[PDB]
Design a protein around this ligand. Structure first.
Ligand SMILES: O=C(NCC(F)(F)F)c1cc(-c2cnc3[nH]c(C4=CCCNC4)cc3c2)cs1
Length: 274
């Protein structure tokens, strides 16, 4: 077994992986019931995985929120870097959607309330995430892994692509998952924090209908569709409540200049308790 500080983990206990990171289940060496997730280098992309893991450490040191994955400890050295992070017994949102197929509007509202709270911190600190997708949304249920989805706590994870963006500046780095990036990102244009809001609206749309709002065969086909259609019409089912209808239509705007902003997102009537 491998040790990182006061924690230990074993490979082949894989609970998550990406192109630039690998995640294993772990535990405190003294308190074995204390579960943690140890994030390590993906050896397939050694040099970049180191850099992205180091950047995530610097970002998460400043982002402490109940709906953001906690960073208990870390270990940066010349040739390796490790992150001892919060473990979530519910898994990621992608696995939950693969099992539930669709979520109730009340469940979406509960999830969106927590995401909006986390995004409120990111926005106030001037940080954009740039990799928001169900795989990077973690679920934690304190009443048991099979308890009521009304008591689920949601945590945003994977901050390796995150960056500070000054309020009068635009970003231009191409990162994230093509299905979830805003049109301006995939079309190689400048973008700001409103790109994350498109990703969130895409996630909310997927939780509602079980599918992505804008289908495509490949990333190149998706960007050609975004190019060809100067306006975007997301099909919203008839049973959708009116507050959720306006939230999705304003989040899934093609032009970021027309897209919903943060202040109107943080106080949207759909988030208001029913
Ligand atoms: O950054 C991250 N992921 C991006 C990338 F690219 F690295 F994958 C992080 C992911 C986690 C984390 C925390 N808790 C977890 N639980 C489970 C369970 C799976 C099935 C059985 N039920 C529980 C998975 C899981 C992952 C911390 S960080």
């Amino acid at each position: 077994t491998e040790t990182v500080g006061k924690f230990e983990f074993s490979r082949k206990d894989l609970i998550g992986h990406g192109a630039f990171a690998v995640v294993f289940k772990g535990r405190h060496r003294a308190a074995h019931d204390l579960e943690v997730a140890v994030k390590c280098i993906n050896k397939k992309n050694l040099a970049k995985s180191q850099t992205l893991l180091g950047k995530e450490i610097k970002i998460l040191k400043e982002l402490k929120h109940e709906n953001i994955v906690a960073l208990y400890d870390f270990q940066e050295m010349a040739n390796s870097v490790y992150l001892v992070m919060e473990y979530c017994n519910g898994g990621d949102l992608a696995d939950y959607l693969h099992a539930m197929r669709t979520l109730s509007e009340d469940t979406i509202r509960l999830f969106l309330q927590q995401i909006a709270g986390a995004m409120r911190l990111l926005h106030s600190k001037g940080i954009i995430h740039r990799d928001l997708k169900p795989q990077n949304i973690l679920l934690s249920n304190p009443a048991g892994r099979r308890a009521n989805p009304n008591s689920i706590r949601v945590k945003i994870a994977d901050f390796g692509f995150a960056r500070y963006l000054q309020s009068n500046m635009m970003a231009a780095t191409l990162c994230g998952s093509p299905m979830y990036m805003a049109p301006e990102v995939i079309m190689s244009q400048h973008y700001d924090g409103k790109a994350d809001l498109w990703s969130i609206g895409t996630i909310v749309y997927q939780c509602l209908t079980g599918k992505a709002p804008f289908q495509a065969s490949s990333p190149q086909d998706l960007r050609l569709f975004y190019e060809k259609n100067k306006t975007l019409v997301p099909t919203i089912p008839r049973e959708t409540s009116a507050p959720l209808r306006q939230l999705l239509l304003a989040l899934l705007q093609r032009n970021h200049k027309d897209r919903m902003d943060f202040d109107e997102f943080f106080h949207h009537p759909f988030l208001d308790a029913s």
